[PDB]
Design brief:
Elements: E1 5-8, E2 12-16, E3 25-29, E4 42-46, E5 52-58, H1 61-66, E6 71-79, E7 85-87, E8 90-94, E9 100-105, E10 110-116, E11 137-141, E12 144-149, E13 157-163, E14 170-179, E15 185-189, E16 192-198, E17 203-211, E18 216-225, E19 231-237, E20 242-247, E21 250-254, E22 256-258
Antiparallel strand pairs: 1-22, 2-21, 3-4, 4-5, 5-6, 7-8, 8-9, 9-10, 11-12, 12-13, 13-14, 15-16, 16-17, 17-18, 19-20, 20-21
Bound molecules: calcium ion (CA) and sodium ion (NA).
The site of calcium ion has 6 residues, from strand 15 and strand 19.
Organism: Homo sapiens
Binding site for Ca(2+): 137, 185-186, 234-235
Protein name: Myocilin, C-terminal fragment
Length: 259
């Protein structure tokens, strides 16, 4: 059910943060939901601040849009930036001021694993073009769990590693030829890395693709809008086959078309 990205639609705002604390952040659903969660369970993390620990959890989409949280997790570890994902019942996030990825089982609220991403730059070393301590960007696609980062050895270019979702061991690593700080964000669809770059605060384009299957790179032009002029997060959800983004207090989704 895969294919290559050929179109990104216009943003649909699902919810707007109540306070300036939610100016940027990350919101997520589980592409492989596990009991007691479902494909509707939605997690939200406002990442404005210096000690981010609160994760808001909504059982229903209707609730995410108009109601209150079902549960609020207080993370044991401090969370960094907006690269986190939820996958198979666990929140995967980066420890504040570290290159450590943490697996946090949501239903038991237990940390199942913590692992340094070998050689990965962190806390401002290899951020996306706009900064934001976005050095490390987790991703989920049709094949499982990934991490997007860079190293001194890769010369600041985007590196991507397939991760073991249980213990976070790196299974395979790819080195691209695109400077990570040259793009505003990135995501993976069907084993292909796509990067997004911004001409302005409101105008963006999917501008580059790297196929992990062939190691073949390619330049693209797939325009789309940052309606609210400050996009801090853009991820792909392989279940819904849509892009989830956070844009200036607004949690939005994008329709896409695959070949
Ligand atoms: Ca991303
Ligand atoms: Na991410």
């Amino acid at each position: 059910g895969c294919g290559e990205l050929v179109w990104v639609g216009e943003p649909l705002t699902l919810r707007t943060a109540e306070t300036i604390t939610g100016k940027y952040g990350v919101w997520m659903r589980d592409p492989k939901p596990t009991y007691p969660y479902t494909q509707e369970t939605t997690w939200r993390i406002d990442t404005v601040g210096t000690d981010v620990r609160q994760v808001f959890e909504y059982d229903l989409i209707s609730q995410f849009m108009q109601g209150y949280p079902s549960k609020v997790h207080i993370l044991p570890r401090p969370l960094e930036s907006t690269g986190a994902v939820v996958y198979s019942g666990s929140l995967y996030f980066q420890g504040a001021e570290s290159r450590t990825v943490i697996r946090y089982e949501l239903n038991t609220e237990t940390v199942k694993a913590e692992k340094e991403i070998p050689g990965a730059g962190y806390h401002g070393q290899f951020p996306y073009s706009w900064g934001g301590y976005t050095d490390i960007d987790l991703a989920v696609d049709e094949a499982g769990l990934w991490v997007i980062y860079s190293t001194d050895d890769a010369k600041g270019a985007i590196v991507l590693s397939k991760l073991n979702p249980e213990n976070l061991e790196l299974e395979q690593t790819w080195e691209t030829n695109i400077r990570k700080q040259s793009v505003a964000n990135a995501f993976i669809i069907c084993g292909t890395l796509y990067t997004v770059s911004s001409y302005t605060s409101a105008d963006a384009t999917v501008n580059f693709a790297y196929d992990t299957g062939t190691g073949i790179s390619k330049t693209l032009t797939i325009p789309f809008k940052n309606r609210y002029k400050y996009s801090s997060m853009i991820d792909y959800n392989p279940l819904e086959k849509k892009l989830f983004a956070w844009d200036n207090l607004n949690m939005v989704t994008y329709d896409i078309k695959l070949s």
